[PDB]
Amino acid sequence: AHLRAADPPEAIVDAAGLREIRLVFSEPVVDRFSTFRAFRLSLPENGIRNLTQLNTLASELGVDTEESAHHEVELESDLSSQSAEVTLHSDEPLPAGAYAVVWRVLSVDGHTTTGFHAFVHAGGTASS
Amino acid sequence: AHLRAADPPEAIVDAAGLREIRLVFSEPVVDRFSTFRAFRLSLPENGIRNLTQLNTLASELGVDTEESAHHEVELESDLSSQSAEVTLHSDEPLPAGAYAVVWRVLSVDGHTTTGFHAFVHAGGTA
Numbered sequence: 292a293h294l295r296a297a298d299p300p301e302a303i304v305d306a307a308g309l310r311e312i313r314l315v316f317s318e319p320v321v322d323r324f325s326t327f328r329a330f331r332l333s334l335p336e337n338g339i340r341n342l343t344q345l346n347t348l349a350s351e352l353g354v355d356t357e358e359s360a361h362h363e364v365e366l367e368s369d370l371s372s373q374s375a376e377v378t379l380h381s382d383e384p385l386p387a388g389a390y391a392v393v394w395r396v397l398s399v400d401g402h403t404t405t406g407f408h409a410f411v412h413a414g415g416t417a418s419s
Numbered sequence: 420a421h422l423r424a425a426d427p428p429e430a431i432v433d434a435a436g437l438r439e440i441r442l443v444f445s446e447p448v449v450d451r452f453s454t455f456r457a458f459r460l461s462l463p464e465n466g467i468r469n470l471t472q473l474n475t476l477a478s479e480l481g482v483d484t485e486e487s488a489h490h491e492v493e494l495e496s497d498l499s500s501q502s503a504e505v506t507l508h509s510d511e512p513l514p515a516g517a518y519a520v521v522w523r524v525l526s527v528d529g530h531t532t533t534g535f536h537a538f539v540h541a542g543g544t545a
């Protein structure tokens with residue numbers, strides 16, 4: 292499988308009120324065996340200067356990351372579109388910050404893949 | 420004259436509770452003839468992918484921008500360090516967002532320059 296589509300995209304977005312992340316894969320995702328988590332990333336003193344730097348940080352996290360050593364976003368996932376689309380619904384609106392979603396997916400073809408998708412939320416839980 | 424340094428710098432910073440922007444120029448700034456404004460930028464639907472894109476948005480603003488066409492930050496400015504450093508104090512903590520600071524400076528050498536500085540505040544007010 293591979294990721295076809297993700298919203299928010301890999302971008303600095305405003306999106307005040309954001310409370311969901313959507314991923315669309317190229318194949319149906321098998322339930323149970325596929326898992327999804329997201330993190331609010333700690334930015335280094337004086338920040339990051341492009342999304343390449345953000346991607347480097349995000350690439351080190353995974354589904355077996357330890358929650359107490361990081362800042363996990365609590366969320367609930369559901370499968371749709373004959374299980375090719377995954378919607379991650381956050382408990383409350385996401386504040387501003389840099390975020391990564393990480394996964395391990397077993398696809399209908401029987402292969403397991405891992406990956407991540409990262410973005411910068413420049414809006415807050417509500418409109419300025 | 421040119422900008423030597425700025426804090427926040429041109430980056431994506433967390434900086435929860437940010438309420439001031441410091442700019443340091445290469446020459447003393449003349450008060451009154453020099454002015455400073457800041458704006459919280461509207462990002463496009465697709466978001467932006469890099470800070471060059473941020474620069475593009477910021478570079479169109481200036482000291483003669485119309486306040487009602489934008490989202491201006493209410494602030495007070497203060498000169499120091501024999502007038503080469505400018506501190507911009509925001510009236511409330513800055514909410515998260517992309518920002519631009521713009522200026523027109525008259526330097527003690529009698530020359531006027533314009534410029535801008537942009538950053539992304541990815542943290543909140545606390």
Ligand SMILES: [Cu+2]
Nearest residue numbers: 420526528530
């Ligand atoms: Cu000059």
